[PDB]
């Protein structure tokens, strides 16, 4: 039988007002199913990523969705810690996810970069909303997560963005555009 | 700008004939979808898990999730090795999966570790008939792999089984249903 | 063809006389039987342990088998070391075991755990006997080895003692005997 | 009280019927018993063995029982698992053990190395009829077991017969034959 | 003066008949010559290889034939094990490798790809068969390490074929062929 | 206020060299210091910029590169004050005795970063080589094998570095070679 | 050629106007710079320092510079992250940094700590403005990663000033100045 | 199909040793090249067959010891590369230029595969001494301090070998005498 | 609602009686208290030890102050394991403590180390009570964790001593007395 | 200029009489020199010995010497702690030491094994009668720390005498004398 | 009773080197092993019975300093051994070929104690210049390159020990200069 009920805030034991805890985990929610759809989204990369530079942006996808992992980790524990009810079955993350996953299929390296720095931007986006909710309703522990979780996140959109750059070795002995 | 669709099967580097990788790849991505839901639900009941024996549970289902993380990393490279398209969207995920997740909100202790027993033993009889095959089309690598995770598999519905014994130190000194 | 007689007392390269290594050896011998006994009961128990408790026992009862070897180990190789012959069979394991093992089958988490405090308590006596008689007859090293080894046992018991305790989180919720 | 008798199965959580885990249970009994005995028999002889080529025998004996502990501790799991009891006392295990233990006394190095390599090859009998047993009755979980199991005990066995064999550094500078 | 004759099998501590072991250390050897010519085709491709993904290639080179190293390790000890006499000499490795090793001299990148991948191509047809020989022929444990060094071997596999895939991040910014 | 030790001069050292060794020895090794602060710099700054299709390779190796680097800075260092000298640690005095010149201030490519790191672990070889030989010539073994150890490191990165460089890619299968 | 001018800020993948990137990379600039000097004024306190206390110094100064080194990893990378350009050459270097480097030759015990304490101070003055900043600017990433560091340089000052007291052992036993 | 080097020839090396150098140098390193891989297939089968009394022992120290010419293999490989050499890996190539021939097919006693593994060694020894030789009077001191990292392992192998064969043992206490 | 009152001895599972338990537990609670007291002086030392030896000290101080914590550790839970409650508030413990706490305030390096040195010395004399004690009681566990104990606390106060020594390197050249 | 005489007892901080330290230390002096002694010997057996065990010796000797030093070690500062002051001149060593080392040469290995044994041996009369006077003077850190060290000499002892036992693999094949 | 070698004479070696190479060579090695054990007995002692305002940096880097001449004394000893040699290992003996004197018996300041160790330090530097060169001469290379990795780490030691004798102190901000 339920004990909780999904989109419903229970008792919390770190004296935040259920006023505070319902938009932090709503919140969270969104956070903690868009990380689940990247988390999904980087390891399909890392499974299906083909070509020239296939060795190195295979092993970047497995560091990035480990990186994801703990992020998620972390954002579960605490959304049920302040007494939300942390969104686990395909439907409700596919509803709470704010960027669109990539469909079904291998797409090229390139592709599947772009795919993910805009899944990151997305994120990112949603993070500092949250980030200044957090602070603004009194909930420090939140913000400062969410400032680490952030730090780490817009390190990702940095790498990804150094694989896209037009530039290579490979210049000096082949014809450009 | 697609380089291959899913559901279907391309050339692989191992010598098998399409008439072997397609149901093998096929079968992969049942039991990767599979995988998926049950690190989804594990990973949940770590995060909502609470009660007098929540430190043990919780402790468990992290140990458990992380186990099935090594089962869906170990499948998705070699599906997609076989030339198979390995699935990653929460619509297909939730088609493919060979049982249904526990619904949204949180459930009894009890009633999580049953969920989870019957999760695995749904899986266990896809493996079984999944490793069958691999061995009846030639392919010694799928079936061994599949075995080795079966064991594993197996290993943890032992574990849950024990959780719902009705057994407990408790018994010495409380009223027996 | 034999080099040395399970029940001789032999040369030792330590300076003893054999009217020390006589009884020391011959209570290193119950003691190791003990142990090994105790070994079995414990592994067994965590082969077997289920219920609400189950993984904290399980944990546990590995704990405490490895830390048993770890005693074995050192007592065998001393008892050797000294002359003696150490006992190696079903057999005569059983007949200088200073408790009776847990009968085959099995038995309630609460029954075993109060076995296996039985089983301690019995080699606690023992021991104490044997680390006096070494001190009298002047085998410092003996007593010294006895010393550490009870140490851990006690400390074994203290726990074991602490699982028996009528105290639980659940005595919040449930109804008591 | 007791839950379970010892020779009769129990519920198990992995979809095997009771007429698969009575059979593979009572095998797997019979392993236990005989790889308790070779522990205790290799343990023995890293306690007792001595002359010119101790210091590697005595190393050997140790990391053969330390392999032989693990084997015993995977067995006993799976056996519980599958709904079985596991033996554990000194009179059952020696009714069940599928060699005959070495007698109490000290042998020489020679004879230990050949009693332990009778006893892994009457060992290697028995786990090859048990996993040819696991395959017939579709427990392919058992049968994957077994062969990590008898690939280990080969080795041992290979490392034991080279122990015994007619060369020598020595026999540059001493009489031979 | 010789102990054992090249070419001949002699006697086993593992119980199996030499109508067992003379297909299966025939067999063993030819495996162990094509992964020393591997071997030593990787590690001369981690010497030399150059260029633009260099750095990557250069690891999976050196990670390569170190696993291939592990695979021989095992194969030569087991062969040893079952009384077989273990190929060494360049001449005969020659004679018994199941494929050509790349001519001397510095291959482009794709080039050396191309070649392990041909390799690994050949020497899983003969893993296949022999896995397929041990089998029938009652050799548990052999079926089995080939199927593990299998695992591996198909696995290096893929990893070569998505080196050689027509992708490349280049792909935004060069003139494509 | 006060110095211990002024630089540009070379103090007493507790390894029984004469100053006709130190001197010298110490005046190579400020060279061989400046030197490599500087590499260092310019490897660590690729690392922070480099980008592109195989930036993740370069990335890795620039940081590897630099920590090497390190390390030799660090023995030369120690050994330079051991040997009564007094190691450079100012921008301009760095800026006067390196043997190469920095690559200058913005983003390079790829290729043109690891060619400036390659010429400039060619200066430092040239520096070592012969500040090697003084030292084998003067007596001070410690110093020329010191040295030795480094150079063998450094011809290393100037081999990986050469590398990357060569005119070989996977892409040449499928793209318009120059 | 250039592919990014000094003293120009580039796009970022992040999401920031070029109105925030601009002033944050030009102070990550002037921050790297000075720790670049502390870095090379550490490091050179390391290879010279002498007397009664050395060897604590010796150890004290090589932690440090290990740690400014650290900082200077973080902030090169986020600055260009951000889309800037980090400076590297003596000359700008020398020409951005918030204090003036000690004078080459060997100065005393005191005085180098003193250097130290006072180019922490200046670095401290620094990034408390530029975390206002950030702070103001809506960067949370920047302020967060001010505030990391901050921490650890205000530890490093309490601990110079600590060297610095006017407190011996020795001052039981001689003359006060 | 097509070759970025041909065998046999040298090529540029980003490290400023002329042609004069590098041509003899990477000639010497793929002989000693060869030699270890000729080694390095003899250890690794002493490690699978030996048998017999002290079979545990030499099992242990034929392991260590193919590990070690491994780790030589590697850096020789490596640097031979880096100075614009083509290193060795065809089996009929390495069997022409190995400086020791291979004990044959077949299992030996402990005694003649330790003596055939000594005997080995010294022949890798004499080659090492004498390209160490001539990598020092030609200039290239990375390459001499290389050989001579390789070469006191290489020694201290033949020490152990040496040991394993001295007429002593524990049973002479006990057993006759030749 | 309490369920042990302090002083008062309850059951212990090591066959120890009461007449015993009751002393030494009075005892332990003496050494705990005493051991809290000065875990908070040697961490107070560490926080605020100044000086030209500050660095050293500094360190001394933590190593001692984690020492004595595993001293505590092991002391307490002995204690209770013996039936004893151990004490835990301020004002208790201000009651038990053997010596007495250095003021609040901060003292120089010298008179700090004096400090330290006189608790080591006042626990020194009442674990050597304690000690003989145990061992007339017959408490053997007891009296080797006292010896045990003993011997570090030993070590420690050698090593403050040596900390004040009218020696220094600085007496070479600064005005001694 | 001298700070402590040697053959001097000086102040300890340990709260013993100078009446417990003189002869303690005293004692300690000639255990310390006799270990160095034992140190020089087994380093050399592990510098020269040679032959058909060779390699097991050599790391025995190795492991001995190393422990020897821990022993060194403890003693050394334990001395220095009493207020002694700890012998360490070639001179002085010889004369305290109480077995005569080993003649300049290279011995047979049992002859080196046979030599070690005798000084085991004489250094296990000294430290009984050494911690059976601590005992009686009241110091039981010097007891307990005189019996952790007897326990492991004494073991390398059993370890000396197994080597020399007059049994070997090879008596199945050489004549026995 | 029967002895396999006799000290003060060199036996056959599997290294292929002349007698007149490893006599001069294990005799030069025993000089430095015995000097080595002297040492490593100092620093042991100086660990044990230091005291003081710098107990504490001292008592740590006589325990470093003395593991890391036990490391010394082990790669000696082994080589000495492999080359024919017979190592030195009794007291008396190791008091006739020490290269310096064993400061006396009984504790004296840490400042002495600092100044006999680098004196000691100061006496093998000399002796182990003499033998590598004589090494380097005779043509073997192998024990030259040894004594060079020890010399390095020998000569750092006296580095350490010069500065913790330098005329310097955090306290001379508050105390009265001699
Ligand atoms: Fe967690
Ligand atoms: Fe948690
Ligand atoms: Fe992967
Ligand atoms: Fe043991
Ligand atoms: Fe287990
Ligand atoms: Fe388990
Ligand atoms: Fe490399
Ligand atoms: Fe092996
Ligand atoms: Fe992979
Ligand atoms: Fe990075
Ligand atoms: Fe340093
Ligand atoms: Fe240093
Ligand atoms: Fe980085
Ligand atoms: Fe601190
Ligand atoms: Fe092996
Ligand atoms: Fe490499
Ligand atoms: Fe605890
Ligand atoms: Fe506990
Ligand atoms: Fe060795
Ligand atoms: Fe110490
Ligand atoms: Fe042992
Ligand atoms: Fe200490
Ligand atoms: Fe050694």
Do not use: W
């Not at 990151?120 to 400062?144: F, H, K, M, N, P």
């Amino acid at each position: 039988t339920l004990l909780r009920n999904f989109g419903n805030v229970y008792d919390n034991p770190v004296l935040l007002d259920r006023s505070v805890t319902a938009p932090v985990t709503e919140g969270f929610n969104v956070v903690l199913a868009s990380f689940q759809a990247l988390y999904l989204q980087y390891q399909k990369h890392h499974f299906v990523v083909e070509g020239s530079e296939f060795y190195s942006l295979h092993e970047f996808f497995n560091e990035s969705y480990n990186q994801v992992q703990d992020h998620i980790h972390e954002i579960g524990e605490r959304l049920d810690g302040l007494g939300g009810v942390p969104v686990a079955t395909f439907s409700k993350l596919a509803e709470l996810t704010c960027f669109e996953q990539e469909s079904e299929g291998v797409y090229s390296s390139r592709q599947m970069v772009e795919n993910d720095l805009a899944a990151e931007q997305a994120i990112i986006g949603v993070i500092r909303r949250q980030a200044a909710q957090a602070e603004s309703l009194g909930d420090r522990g939140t913000r400062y997560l969410y400032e680490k979780i952030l730090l780490k996140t817009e390190e990702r959109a940095y790498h990804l963005s150094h694989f896209l750059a037009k530039d290579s070795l490979t210049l000096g002995f082949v014809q450009a555009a």
